[PDB]
Structures are given as structure tokens and as C-alpha cells.
Amino acid sequence: ELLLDSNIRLWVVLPIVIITFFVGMIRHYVSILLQSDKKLTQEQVSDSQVLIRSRVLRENGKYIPKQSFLTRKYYFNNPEDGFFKKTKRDPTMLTDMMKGNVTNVLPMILIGGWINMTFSGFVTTKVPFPLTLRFKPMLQQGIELLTLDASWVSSASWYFLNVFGLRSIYSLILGQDNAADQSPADTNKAFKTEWEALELTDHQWALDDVEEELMAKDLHFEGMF
Amino acid sequence: PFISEAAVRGNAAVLDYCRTSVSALSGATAGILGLTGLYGFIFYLLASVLLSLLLILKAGRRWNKYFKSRRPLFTGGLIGGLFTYVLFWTFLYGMVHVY
Amino acid sequence: FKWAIELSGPGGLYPVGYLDKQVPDTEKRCWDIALGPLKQIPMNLFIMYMAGNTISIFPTMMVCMMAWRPIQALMAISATFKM
Amino acid sequence: VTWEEMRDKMRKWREENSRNSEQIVEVGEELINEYASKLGDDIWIIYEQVMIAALDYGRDDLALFCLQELRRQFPGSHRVKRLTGMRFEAMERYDDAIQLYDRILQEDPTNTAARKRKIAIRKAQGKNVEAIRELNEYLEQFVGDQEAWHELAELYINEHDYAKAAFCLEELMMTNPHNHLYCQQYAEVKYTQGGLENLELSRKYFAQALKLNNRNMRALFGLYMSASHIASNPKASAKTKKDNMKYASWAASQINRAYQFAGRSKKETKYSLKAVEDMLE
Amino acid sequence: NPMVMMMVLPLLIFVL
Amino acid sequence: PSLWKGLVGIGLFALAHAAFSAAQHRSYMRLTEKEDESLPIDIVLQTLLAFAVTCYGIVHIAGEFKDMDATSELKNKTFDTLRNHPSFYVFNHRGRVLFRP
Numbered sequence: 001e002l003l004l005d006s007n008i009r010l011w012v013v014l015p016i017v018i019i020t021f022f023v024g025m026i027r028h029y030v031s032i033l034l035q036s037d038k039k040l041t042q043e044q045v046s047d048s049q050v051l052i053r054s055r056v057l058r059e060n061g062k063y064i065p066k067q068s069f070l071t072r073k074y075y076f077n078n079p080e081d082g083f084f085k086k087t088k089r090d091p092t093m094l095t096d097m098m099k100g101n102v103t104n105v106l107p108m109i110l111i112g113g114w115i116n117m118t119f120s121g122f123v124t125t126k127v128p129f130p131l132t133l134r135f136k137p138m139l140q141q142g143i144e145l146l147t148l149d150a151s152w153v154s155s156a157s158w159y160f161l162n163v164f165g166l167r168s169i170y171s172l173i174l175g176q177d178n179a180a181d182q183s184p185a186d187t188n189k190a191f192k193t194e195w196e197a198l199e200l201t202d203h204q205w206a207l208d209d210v211e212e213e214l215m216a217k218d219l220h221f222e223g224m225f
Numbered sequence: 226p227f228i229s230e231a232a233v234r235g236n237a238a239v240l241d242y243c244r245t246s247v248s249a250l251s252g253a254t255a256g257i258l259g260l261t262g263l264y265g266f267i268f269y270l271l272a273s274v275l276l277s278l279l280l281i282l283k284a285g286r287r288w289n290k291y292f293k294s295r296r297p298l299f300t301g302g303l304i305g306g307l308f309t310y311v312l313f314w315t316f317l318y319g320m321v322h323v324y
Numbered sequence: 325f326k327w328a329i330e331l332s333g334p335g336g337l338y339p340v341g342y343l344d345k346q347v348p349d350t351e352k353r354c355w356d357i358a359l360g361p362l363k364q365i366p367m368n369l370f371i372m373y374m375a376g377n378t379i380s381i382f383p384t385m386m387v388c389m390m391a392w393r394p395i396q397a398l399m400a401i402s403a404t405f406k407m
Numbered sequence: 408v409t410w411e412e413m414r415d416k417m418r419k420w421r422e423e424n425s426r427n428s429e430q431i432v433e434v435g436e437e438l439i440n441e442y443a444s445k446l447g448d449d450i451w452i453i454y455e456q457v458m459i460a461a462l463d464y465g466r467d468d469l470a471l472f473c474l475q476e477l478r479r480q481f482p483g484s485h486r487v488k489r490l491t492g493m494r495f496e497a498m499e500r501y502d503d504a505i506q507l508y509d510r511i512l513q514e515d516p517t518n519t520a521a522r523k524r525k526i527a528i529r530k531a532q533g534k535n536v537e538a539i540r541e542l543n544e545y546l547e548q549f550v551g552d553q554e555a556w557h558e559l560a561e562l563y564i565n566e567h568d569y570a571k572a573a574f575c576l577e578e579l580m581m582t583n584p585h586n587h588l589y590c591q592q593y594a595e596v597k598y599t600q601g602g603l604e605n606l607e608l609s610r611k612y613f614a615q616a617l618k619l620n621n622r623n624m625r626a627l628f629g630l631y632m633s634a635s636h637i638a639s640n641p642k643a644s645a646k647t648k649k650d651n652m653k654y655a656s657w658a659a660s661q662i663n664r665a666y667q668f669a670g671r672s673k674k675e676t677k678y679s680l681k682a683v684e685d686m687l688e
Numbered sequence: 689n690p691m692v693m694m695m696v697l698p699l700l701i702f703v704l
Numbered sequence: 705p706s707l708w709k710g711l712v713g714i715g716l717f718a719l720a721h722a723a724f725s726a727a728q729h730r731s732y733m734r735l736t737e738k739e740d741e742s743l744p745i746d747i748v749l750q751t752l753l754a755f756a757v758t759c760y761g762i763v764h765i766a767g768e769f770k771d772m773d774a775t776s777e778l779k780n781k782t783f784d785t786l787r788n789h790p791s792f793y794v795f796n797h798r799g800r801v802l803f804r805p
């Protein structure tokens with residue numbers, strides 16, 4: 001094998017892991033700090049909630065009798081009722097959203113570049129599987145060796161492996177669906193597509209056969225205590 | 226019947242937590258043993274099915290109300306487990322066998 | 325029934341959604357849905373192939389491209405069929 | 408009996424909206440007096456309930472303490488502003504509360520708490536018609552608020568416009584298919600509303616509630632009595648007559664079973680037997 | 689950094 | 705029970721000890737340079753047993769599953785709770801007059 005310097009472990013192996021871990025935590029906390037809810041006026045939230053009600057009705061109107069459902073239909077999509085017909089209406093926001101989208105990966109690549117400069121010229125760890133020789137130019141940046149086994153990796157790619165393999169740990173400790181990783185706008189068209197979709201939808205009163213499917217088996221009663 | 230989003234999300238979260246922890250531990254163990262190459266990767270698969278067996282024990286009987294099917298027990302987030310497994314494998318095989 | 329009490333009677337804008345009058349108003353797509361990804365995948369594949377040295381200088385981009393249109397479709401084959 | 412135990416009990420008593428003001432105010436006072444510093448900001452939400460209970464409990468002495476702490480901690484906060492509004496309403500001080508809610512609305516129009524509190528003031532003043540109108544107007548901008556929807560249904564039931572209440576309960580079930588309480592309440596409202604054309608819906612929804620929960624024995628004998636009323640109605644057809652007789656017989660069998668279980672669970676005189684003595688009648 | 693540029697060009701590609 | 709948590713701790717400790725042993729054994733080779741190229745049976749058995757016990761503990765530590773059927777936790781919700789509507793509270797009831805003002 002290779003008699004690697006022990007001091008490479010205490011200052012190039014562990015610090016990379018610590019930096020990656022706490023930079024991920026920093027990124028997640030900065031992401032939650034930056035997020036601010038955009039101000040919404042009454043009309044937009046009102047129409048969003050209205051289409052929410054329409055979609056949930058389309059989903060589970062089976063538990064509602066037929067006359068109530070077709071009255072819903074009359075109210076939603078019918079000339080005479082009027083609803084769904086008489087219901088319609090470098091920039092800072094683009095720069096802000098582009099910067100927010102950029103800040104999810106670019107800080108990782110900048111940290112990688114800084115690590116590649118700072119820790120250039122080492123052999124940090126041996127990747128325990130035989131990587132291909134054609135992968136040499138990116139795993140072993142800063143090394144002039146030629147016959148060195150491809151399984152030996154410099155600092156930058158070791159940090160990259162660390163940042164790829166630590167997202168699951170982030171989900172483990174930080175919380176479910178954390179933001180530390182590496183990876184309606186228009187209502188008129190929404191109104192029209194809801195119109196067409198709920199026109200295409202049908203009715204099936206799920207209570208037409210509940211009694212017969214209930215009469216078949218006795219009612220569970222144990223555990224009353 | 227009537228699935229509840231919160232409960233299924235909690236079940237997915239606990240399964241993912243168990244998978245991530247077991248994959249990290251398996252990486253640490255494979256690094257400890259000094260397994261190298263394909264023989265290492267197979268071990269991970271073995272570890273995975275071991276976890277599956279444990280999950281089968283954890284769900285146990287009457288699991289039909291816990292999951293629609295046993296499939297997420299076996300192949301639930303396998304690649305996410307593999308990434309952390311290889312990370313911890315490299316970590317331990319580096320700070321145990323290389324030096 | 326000796327205790328059949330009736331509680332209805334007087335009914336008093338109207339609540340939203342209410343309407344008093346009782347109105348009496350009342351292969352194939354799968355082929356296109358499958359051919360969608362079958363035609364969109366080569367586009368990303370063609371872009372990645374035409375990248376050339378750019379793809380070689382971008383090891384992560386190739387993996388993302390191969391996992392976006394392909395791989396994911398194979399992984400979500402059951403989901404694609406169910407959709 | 409450790410502070411974690413009463414903290415968890417308070418959390419449970421908050422998750423489901425209970426109104427046992429005495430117990431919750433006692434536990435909250437104990438928590439904020441003995442174990443106030445034993446845990447962090449998690450008592451702050453408690454400081455909400457504790458005052459509301461106080462206003463429910465009538466013990467206004469600690470309401471000022473909680474309000475002053477929250478205000479000194481959270482200046483210019485809409486939640487604390489609504490909380491001050493409730494404090495004002497505790498003594499029927501309505502004009503100042505209305506002015507405060509109007510100020511909150513003009514400071515933030517998307518806030519929903521102020522509208523609910525102002526209509527609560529209106530319904531406390533007895534102006535039921537204007538309260539109903541205000542709720543109808545408020546829903547026109549916030550369709551989908553389940554709590555206000557159920558409150559409007561309850562107000563309509565109290566004022567006895569059972570058609571509107573039934574409609575609101577129907578749309579509530581649209582929102583929540585899986586809650587058997589809504590199904591039971593709607594079955595009751597429909598049964599109260601009219602006759603066979605509504606009795607069929609009432610019995611169907613009672614059966615649906617029973618399917619969604621076997622223990623809702625309230626809805627069990629509600630279905631039983633609805634079937635019995637359908638049977639007694641002359642307008643019922645012969646096939647409908649025999650169908651509802653079968654439903655009533657099944658419901659009676661289930662009632663005897665349920666009361667037999669009520670019997671084996673406890674140990675006393677057989678009132679449940681007396682109870683099924685009613686069913687045999 | 690040549691590495692930073694060669695790894696941020698895919699980032700622009702990843703966004704697009 | 706809570707002891708499960710304690711169990712997993714010792715498991716990690718066991719694994720940690722294995723690491724030390726492995727390190728020492730590596731030094732062995734780094735001072736023996738013989739054609740052994742094999743770990744002691746004791747260390748591999750200890751590592752495998754620690755892995756088994758730690759994984760079994762972790763499975764318990766993960767928590768308890770939750771049922772998908774939405775009518776599970778809602779079964780015990782009596783009608784006396786769902787009707788309260790905390791936002792629409794009214795304080796013109798007999799509670800204030802009956803109790804100490």
C-alpha cells in the first residue's frame with residue numbers, strides 16, 4: 001500500500017467532513033432565514049381557495065347525493081349562474097428568484113474550488129473500489145504521479161463524495177424534507193381548465209350501495225371499555 | 226379505504242430514517258472490515274435485506290394498515306442508502322486501513 | 325310514534341354555493357402519453373451528445389441528463405403505467 | 408406527575424379544541440408558576456390558552472398578567488391584537504374591540520382572525536341575522552374554511568333554516584369525507600328537515616357513518632329510528648316498506664348486541680335490558 | 689479557477 | 705422501552721472499540737510486513753455482532769408506525785370536541801356570571 005502521512009488525517013480528512021457537514025447546516029438555516037412569504041391580496045387567495053374547493057369536490061363528490069352534485073355543477077360551469085364566467089382579471093422578483101435558485105448549488109461548487117486550492121498536492125484517502133483510469137484527471141487534481149492507482153483521491157473529489165453522501169444524514173438529523181442538499185401563476189387558464197375538466201367529470205353517489213355492503217357483516221364492538 | 230397523508234408521510238419518514246441509519250452503519254462496518262471492491266458492494270445489499278427482514282419484524286402482522294404493500298420495505302430509497310453507505314465505507318476504510 | 329317532534333318551519337345574502345331551485349340539469353391516450361417521454365428523451369440525449377467536450381468537462385451534467393429523461397422512466401415504470 | 412406529563416396533556420387538550428376551562432386553566436397556572444422556566448418557548452402557546460380559559464373561567468386576575476407578558480414580548484402582533492380583543496370582549500366592551508379589529512384589518516387585509524372575532528361579537532350581541540350575513544360575506548372571500556363553515560351550519564341549525572345547514576354540512580363532507588361526525592350531524596339535520604325524500608338521505612348517511620365508525624351507536628339508533636319512521640309512513644312503497652323493515656330489524660339486532668356489550672363491560676342493574684325493553688316495543 | 693468554470697458551466701446547463 | 709436507546713449506545717461503543725482494534729492490527733502489519741493480509745477472527749466477529757445488535761436497536765429507535773386509514777385516530781373524537789370552533793368563541797355564557805368575576 002502507501003504509508004500516508006498521519007497528519008493528513010487530522011487536518012485534511014476530518015476538517016473536510018466537518019466543513020461539509022456544518023456548511024450544509026449553515027445553508028439550510030440561511031435558506032429558512034431568507035424565505036419570506038410574498039404578500040397576497042384578497043382576490044388571489046380567494047380564487048385559489050375556490051379552485052381548491054372545486055378540486056376537492058371533483059375528487060370526493062361521491063359521498064354527496066346526485067341533486068347536490070348537479071347543483072354544484074350548475075353553480076360552477078353554466079352561463080346562467082355566471083360563476084367561472086364573470087370571474088377573472090432587470091425586475092426585482094426575477095433577480096431574487098434566480099439568486100435563490102442559484103444559491104442551492106453554487107456555494108457547494110465554490111467551497112469545492114476553495115478546498116481544491118487550499119488542500120492541493122495531497123493524497124487524502126483511498127477510495128475502496130477500483131475506479132477507472134479514465135477518471136484520473138478529476139480525482140487526482142494537483143498530483144503529478146502517472147502510475148498511481150486510480151483509487152487514490154485528492155482533497156477536492158473527497159469533499160465532493162462527502163457532500164454527495166451527507167444529504168441522507170441531513171434528513172436524519174435536521175428534519176424531514178430539509179433544504180440542505182445538492183439536487184397558480186395564472187387563474188384564467190386555470191378557470192378554463194377547471195371548467196372543461198368538471199364538464200368531463202361524472203357523478204357516482206357512493207351511498208347507493210353502502211347499506212348492502214354494511215348489512216353483510218356485523219358491527220365491530222369489542223374494546224368498548 | 227381512506228388514506229391519511231400525515232400518517233403515510235410519517236411512515237415514509239421513519240422508514241427513510243431507519244434506512245439511512247442502517248446504510249451509514251453498514252458503511253462504517255464495511256470500512257472497519259477492510260472490504261474492497263465488489264465484495265464490499267454485495268455486503269451492502271446483504272445489509273439492506275437484513276434491514277428489510279427487521280422491518281418485516283417491525284411491521285409484523287396486520288401490516289396491511291401500515292403500507293399498501295411491502296415493496297417500500299425492500300426497495301425504499303435504495304440509492305439514497307447506497308450513497309451514504311459508500312461515503313461511510315470510504316470514511317472508515319480511510320481512517321482504519323489506509324493509515 | 326308518541327315523540328315525533330318536528331323542528332322545521334320558518335326559513336327566515338344567501339350563503340355562497342346555495343341555489344334554492346331544484347334544477348334538473350345533467351393505444352389511444354396511453355399511446356401519446358408513452359410516446360411523450362419516448363420522444364422527449366432523445367432531445368435531451370441529442371443535446372448531451374452534441375455537447376461533446378462540454379459533456380466531458382461536465383461529469384455531473386451527463387449523470388443528471390441520463391437520470392432525468394432516462395433511468396427515472398425505468399425507475400418509475402410502474403408509476404408511468406399507472407398514470 | 409412531572410411537568411412533561413402536564414405539558415403533554417395540555418398539548419393534547421389543545422390539539423382537540425376542548426373547553427373544560429377549569430381543568431386547563433388550573434394546569435396552565437401550575438405550569439406557568441412552578442415549571443415556567445423548565446421548558447422554553449413551548450409555554451408561549453400555552454399563554455394563549457391560559458388566558459382564554461381565564462375568560463371562559465371568569466378568573467380575570469391572570470388574564471392581565473398573560474396579556475401583559477405577551478404584549479411586552481410581541482409588540483404590534485396581530486395574534487396578540489386579537490387576544491387583546493378577546494380580553495376586551497370578556498367585559499362586553501364591544502366598541503373598542505370593533506375599532507381594534509378594524510385597525511388590524513386596515514393594517515393587514517388577509518388576516519382571518521379579525522373577521523371571525525367581529526362576527527363572534529355580533530353573534531354575542533344577539534344580532535343573529537346580521538351575523539349570518541357577515542359570515543356569508545366572509546365566506547365569499549374564504550371558501551374552504553372548515554371551521555367557519557361548521558359554525559355557519561350550527562348558526563343555521565340554531566335559527567332553524569335546515570336547508571342551508573344541510574347544504575353547508577354537505578359541502579363540509581365534501582371537504583372531509585373521512586370524518587364520521589360530519590356524516591352523523593348531516594343525517595340528523597336531513598332527518599329533521601323533512602320527510603321520506605329526506606329520510607332516505609338521512610338513513611343512507613347514518614349507514615355511511617356506521618361504516619366509517621362502528622362505535623357511533625348514536626348514529627346506529629338514529630338509523631334505526633329513521634327506518635322505523637320510514638316504515639310507519641303510509642307513502643312508503645311495499646318494496647321500500649320491506650327494505651326499511653329489514654333495516655330496522657338489523658339495527659334492532661345491533662342495538663341488542665351493543666347493549667349486551669354495555670352489560671358485560673359494567674357490573675350493575677340491567678338498565679340496558681330495560682333499554683332493549685324499549686326496542687322490543 | 690478552470691475547475692470552477694468547468695463545473696459551473698454544467699450548473700448553467702443544469703438550470704437550463 | 706427507553707433502554708433500547710441505551711442499547712444502541714453500547715453498540716456504537718462496541719463498533720468504536722472495533723475500530724481501535726483494527727487500527728492496532730494495521731500497525732501490526734505496518735511492523736510485521738508479512739503475507740498475512742487477514743484480520744483477526746475476534747475483531748471481525750466483534751464488529752459483526754456489534755453491527756447486528758446496533759441495527760436491531762436502531763430499528764426500535766426509529767419509532768412506531770402510523771396507520772393509513774384516516775378513521776383510526778378520529779374514532780375517539782366525540783362530538784363534544786369538534787363543535788367548539790376555537791376562533792368563534794363567545795364569552796356571553798353563564799360561566800362568567802356563575803364563576804368569580
Ligand SMILES: CCCCCCCC/C=C\CCCCCCCC(=O)OC[C@H](COP(=O)(O)OCC[N+](C)(C)C)OC(=O)CCCCCCC/C=C\CCCCCCCC
Binds near residue numbers: 017250
Ligand atoms: C460510526 C458511524 C455511525 C454514524 C452515526 C449515524 C447513525 C446514528 C443514529 C441515531 C442514534 C441516536 C438515537 C437517538 C434518538 C434520535 C431520534 C429520536 O427518536 O429522538 C427524538 C429527538 C428529537 O427528534 P429529531 O427531530 O431531532 O429527529 C429528526 C426527526 N426525523 C427522524 C423524523 C427527521 O432526537 C434528539 O434527541 C436529537 C438528536 C437526533 C439524532 C442525532 C444524531 C445525528 C448526529 C450526527 C449524525 C452524523 C453526523 C457526524 C457523522 C459524520 C461522518 C461522515
